[PDB]
């Protein structure tokens, strides 16, 4: 699929002394490359992968400035929405944002997004056309009228159409050897006879990138064996991810079940079994 550059912002209000904790992470697809935390002593934007350290100190100064100002803005937005929802100052509340841009075939913006949530549920999202807003509730309609009046949609559009895609191109060039190759999952099926007349088969896919993957089981019928103990996709810790799907089959019919794997690192769906 098309490459992506995105930014995730988490702002948490504190009851204790009126400020707010702001944490920002930056991703080039499924690889984190920057971070920021104003809990730190004299906070700065910090590198989190080797390649991004090819950027000079002017870049780091700028980024630091931009995220500090954004942090102040989210600090005031916390109070604003607290007023919108008629909530007191005793409790802690969260304001989250995720925005970003995908890189198109012509070298320009394929699509972009900017979504904001309050306390973990949709608040306001920028529509696909990048010229309108979808408000998730009544309080978000106030925000949306404010944003239509002063045309924040054009600011989001100017960012995602210029700065975002250009920076994403420069990044994909910088991290050429790691960001641009999708490594396929190394797959294998293990067997664990445990339950009475029941034997667990587990299909493992390890060490793949990007994170999206499909792991299903199949027996004599057509549907995915919903004899599926499927875990959430998890980071390996070195940039890749892993996953597995397990089920319990009678001791006799191990060869009647096949694990199907699908991942963009493979040109075709993979099929494997307990050998």
């Amino acid at each position: 699929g098309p490459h992506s550059l995105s930014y995730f912002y988490t702002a948490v209000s504190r009851p204790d002394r009126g400020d707010s904790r702001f944490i920002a992470v930056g991703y080039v697809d499924d690889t984190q490359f920057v971070r920021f935390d104003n809990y730190a002593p004299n906070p700065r934007m910090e590198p989190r992968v080797p390649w991004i350290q090819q950027e000079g100190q002017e870049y780091w100064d700028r980024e630091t400035r931009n995220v500090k100002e954004t942090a102040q803005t989210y600090g005031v937005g916390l109070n604003t929405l607290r007023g919108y929802y008629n909530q007191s100052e005793a409790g802690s509340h969260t304001l989250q944002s995720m925005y970003g841009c995908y890189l198109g075939p012509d070298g320009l913006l394929l699509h972009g997004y900017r979504q904001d949530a309050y306390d973990g549920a949709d608040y306001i999202a920028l529509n696909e056309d990048l010229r309108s807003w979808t408000a998730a509730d009544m309080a978000a309609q106030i925000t949306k009228r404010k944003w239509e009046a002063a045309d924040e949609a054009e600011r989001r559009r100017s960012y995602l159409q210029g700065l975002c895609v250009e920076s994403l191109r420069r990044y994909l060039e910088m991290g050429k050897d790691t960001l641009q190759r999708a490594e396929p999952p190394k797959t294998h099926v293990t067997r664990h006879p445990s339950s009475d007349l029941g034997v667990t088969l587990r299909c493992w896919a390890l060490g793949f990138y990007p994170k999206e993957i499909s792991l299903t089981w199949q027996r004599e019928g057509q549907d995915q064996s919903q004899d599926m103990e499927l875990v959430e996709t998890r980071p390996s810790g070195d940039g890749t991810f892993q996953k597995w799907a397990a089920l319990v089959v009678p001791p006799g019919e191990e060869q009647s079940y096949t694990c199907h794997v699908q991942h963009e690192g493979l040109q075709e769906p993979l099929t494997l079994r307990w050998d």
Binding site: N66, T73, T143, R155, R156, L163, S167
Partner: peptide
């Protein structure tokens, strides 16, 4: 050169 300037608020 990555981040969006979100001072575009006081708005939310």
């Amino acid at each position: 050169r990555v981040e969006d300037v979100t001072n575009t608020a006081e708005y939310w």
